[PDB]
Amino acid sequence: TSAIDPVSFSLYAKDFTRFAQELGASFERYGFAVLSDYDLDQARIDAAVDSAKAFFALPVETKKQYAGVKGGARGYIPFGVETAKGADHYDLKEFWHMGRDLPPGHRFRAHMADNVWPAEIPAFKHDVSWLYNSLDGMGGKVLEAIATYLKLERDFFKPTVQDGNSVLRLLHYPPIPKDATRAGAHGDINTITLLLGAEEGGLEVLDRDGQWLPINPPPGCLVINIGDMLERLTNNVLPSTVHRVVNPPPERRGVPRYSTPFFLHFASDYEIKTLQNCVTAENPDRYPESITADEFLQQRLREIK
Numbered sequence: 001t002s003a004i005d006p007v008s009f010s011l012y013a014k015d016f017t018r019f020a021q022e023l024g025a026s027f028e029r030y031g032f033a034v035l036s037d038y039d040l041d042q043a044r045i046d047a048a049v050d051s052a053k054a055f056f057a058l059p060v061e062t063k064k065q066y067a068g069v070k071g072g073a074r075g076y077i078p079f080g081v082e083t084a085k086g087a088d089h090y091d092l093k094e095f096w097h098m099g100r101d102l103p104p105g106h107r108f109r110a111h112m113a114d115n116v117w118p119a120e121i122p123a124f125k126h127d128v129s130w131l132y133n134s135l136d137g138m139g140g141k142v143l144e145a146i147a148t149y150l151k152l153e154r155d156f157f158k159p160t161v162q163d164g165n166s167v168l169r170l171l172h173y174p175p176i177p178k179d180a181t182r183a184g185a186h187g188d189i190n191t192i193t194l195l196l197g198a199e200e201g202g203l204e205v206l207d208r209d210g211q212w213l214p215i216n217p218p219p220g221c222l223v224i225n226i227g228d229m230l231e232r233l234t235n236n237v238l239p240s241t242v243h244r245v246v247n248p249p250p251e252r253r254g255v256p257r258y259s260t261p262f263f264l265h266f267a268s269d270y271e272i273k274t275l276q277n278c279v280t281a282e283n284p285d286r287y288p289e290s291i292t293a294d295e296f297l298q299q300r301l302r303e304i305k
């Protein structure tokens, strides 16, 4: 079962007022929403996924040409080990990260590193860049709904996410002939995160009462969650919630898993200052000192580490 009912993207054009209410209410309750009937070209989503699969199928030494770049913030991250007690013996996953391609001379280049690209997969730059920009665009439309839900101007978020420090992650879990007991519990630090392909993927959100709720959408949906930047902007009216991915069942073991989440971030220089309509007698301002998105990013990374 899924704990969160999908809201059709068809409502974005047909009845935007209802779209914003239903999506917003879901974010406010759970920190998550499920969006069905997206208009993204599925063949081009599938092409990006195929390029990811092709990249991860390359020899290890070929992949490692793209490792050690900016601490893994761009390019490839190989299989590694969790040294902590209680960690599974094997937690094998490999990553590719794509950040924003900035124009020459852009003011953010001093702190946002250039992308690297795998020459061995000729279509990768094109196919994967399309997916980055497609998910960034859909994120903008979701943010319109969030803005309206919050009784803001519909285009409120537009300048706030322009040239945002967003990351498309390509993630692969190879099949291992062994049971775990997948993604340890965490929250996201960014604005919103958009996840394709979560059907029968084991995603769960921690509810307020400490129960884990399955988020198991039908195919052709996006699962979207609030991150800490947006939680902070809204004086915690919209919560950034803890989620995990459980191991597949015995039957689904043996299948490789790929995921391509898009972590949408505010512009680095955007000052996060508490929305005054989220500051009330019962919910006083938790953030009297404002902070830029990049300052907040750096702080959360320091605290995570």
Ligand SMILES: [Cl-]
Binding pocket: 105, 106, 107, 108
């Ligand atoms: Cl600039």
